[PDB]
Amino acid sequence: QNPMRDLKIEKLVLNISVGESGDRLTRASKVLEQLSGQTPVQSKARYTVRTFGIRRNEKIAVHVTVRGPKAEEILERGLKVKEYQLRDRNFSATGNFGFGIDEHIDLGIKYDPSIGIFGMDFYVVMNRPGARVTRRKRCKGTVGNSHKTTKEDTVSWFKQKYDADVLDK
Amino acid sequence: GKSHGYRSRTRYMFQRDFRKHGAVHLSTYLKVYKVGDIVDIKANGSIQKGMPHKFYQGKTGVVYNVTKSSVGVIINKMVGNRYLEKRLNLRVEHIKHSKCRQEFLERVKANAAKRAEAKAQGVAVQLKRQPAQPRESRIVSTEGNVPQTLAPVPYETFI
């Protein structure tokens, strides 16, 4: 309709949730750092479950957010092992969609020992030009209902751009 | 054992009003108090500094001292068989002007105006207030207002 209402990716979050901290955490951090081109941020456990062998503030996970044509080209690579084929699931009612792949170090980048193998969750967040109104400091507002992102709109754009398919589990 | 702390038994009177919590509006802080002003004490529970003791909730006094963020209020407190002068240091959050003294000052101006006019024309202006006087005679016309009413009513169950 209105060219200022078209969809676009605003961020992609790469996540690794390691069971523990230490050598595995540091290897995952180096993986995420090299892949994103930025230094990643580590995440501490919220509380002690201890059935997963975790304790509070243990730094059990590592993640990074990428935006722009960077995230465009990581997402371009990350869909290849899915052969441009996702599900009717993996799409949220709020418009965001994501998938997780069990070895992306071995999708396009080099493997070597002392780094091991890992799986990354890719989570994409979609929006429209105007999403600043819910992030800016002054006169913070809420997106209008006609401007919201929906699962059907995200699916339609994900099918037409990147010529993909869904629902085929 | 018994408990008689500073804020004991203040559970309801240091509440904020329903749907009236949060920050204080700036008209509290834009009010000017001079020495001799007559003020009413009512603690704002959200400001825990300069808070009056529970006794002085609802007391009215005279300002004797004015400081950076507080006023000094003189209250007469009945202790035994006499009143003792009590001096309080209260932030202006817990303080409002006595509206009764506002109408007294306006009435003083109005009294001066009445005497000023009477000094020229219409002498004996009779400044003093008078209590509610008994009504004078009147003629209650019936025309269009014919009296019509019935007697007491029988008892009915209504259950």
Binding site: K137, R138, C139, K140, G141 | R19, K20, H21, G22, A23, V24, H25, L26, S27, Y29, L30, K31, V32, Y33, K34, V66, T67, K68, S69, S70, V71, V92
Partner: protein, 292 residues
């Protein structure tokens, strides 16, 4: 979704301007509240607000019935003083701070004294109270919801007002050219920012680099045939004109208030009466339940 009735009933709405996200009442209380033993002395604020395409500077005191503006200066009137481009840059913030400073001093009659900083050197210097004379006009910067940052244009306005004559307390901490490792302010860099040096050197740097980006940016400079080297004198003349005549000539205001009212009234949707609401209810009952 589907907020409950008890939720709606028990909800306490914030203050109107807090809901609009325009006022920090926490900061405002400390900005506005006056020493009680200074009973009726107003506390003046140099309110600086930055919107897209415009800069707003106001000298504001507070009353019960509302805030009162002693003097105001807007960026968009700078073409009278010679600035027709870059109406929101750091140098424009300096110029509008100098305008509101001189205008305030002219209104209050504090121009014969308190000339401020005549020759600009970017040196951290307040307005000193003259010996055997009235004190300088004292205002406090009110930046609103602006984040504090070294190099912000709101501190550019603060600098322009202070160098223009008003006494406004501040530190050189947040001026550009303030090194972080050492507590030292660079007057050469601060002078460049005051006189628009950064935009000027961007013009040569970008033009030497390429042409496709520099074509689109600074089109107005190309239209008026303005060289980057020609910014220093035009800003200097802008300050000269501002100090010469801050008299605040308003617009001629074509299409008088009443005509503006008649123009904007006739396109404004108005509330329906209760009889019209009732007739709508009745017709909707017939439409939605009249056996289709």
């Amino acid at each position: 979704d589907a907020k409950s009735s008890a939720y709606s009933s028990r909800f306490q709405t914030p203050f109107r301007r807090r809901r609009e996200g325009k006022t920090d009442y926490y900061q405002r209380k400390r900005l506005v509240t006056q020493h009680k033993a200074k009973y009726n002395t107003p506390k003046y604020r140099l309110v600086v607000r930055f919107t897209n395409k415009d800069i707003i500077c106001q000298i504001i005191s507070s009353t019960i019935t509302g805030d009162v503006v002693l003097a105001a200066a807007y960026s968009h009137e700078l073409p009278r003083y010679g600035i027709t481009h870059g109406l929101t840059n750091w140098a424009a913030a300096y110029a509008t701070g100098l305008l509101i400073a001189r205008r305030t001093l002219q209104k209050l009659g504090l121009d014969e004294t308190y000339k401020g900083v005549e020759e600009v050197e970017g040196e951290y210097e307040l307005t000193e109270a003259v010996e055997d004379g009235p004190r300088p006009f004292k205002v406090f910067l009110d930046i609103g919801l602006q984040r504090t940052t070294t190099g912000a244009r709101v501190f550019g306005a603060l600098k322009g007002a202070s160098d223009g004559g008003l006494y406004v307390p501040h530190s050189e901490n947040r001026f550009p050219g303030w090194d972080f490792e050492t507590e030292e302010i660079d007057p050469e860099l601060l002078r460049s920012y005051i006189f628009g040096g950064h935009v000027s050197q961007y013009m040569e740097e970008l033009a030497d680099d390429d042409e496709e980006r520099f074509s689109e940016l600074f089109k107005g400079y190309l239209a008026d045939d303005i060289d980057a080297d020609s910014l220093e004198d035009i800003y200097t003349s802008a300050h000269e004109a501002i100090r010469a005549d801050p008299a605040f000539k308003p617009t001629e205001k074509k299409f008088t208030k009443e005509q503006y009212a008649a123009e904007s009234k006739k396109y404004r949707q108005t509330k329906l009466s209760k009889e019209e609401r009732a007739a709508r209810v009745a017709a909707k009952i017939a439409a939605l339940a009249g056996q289709q």
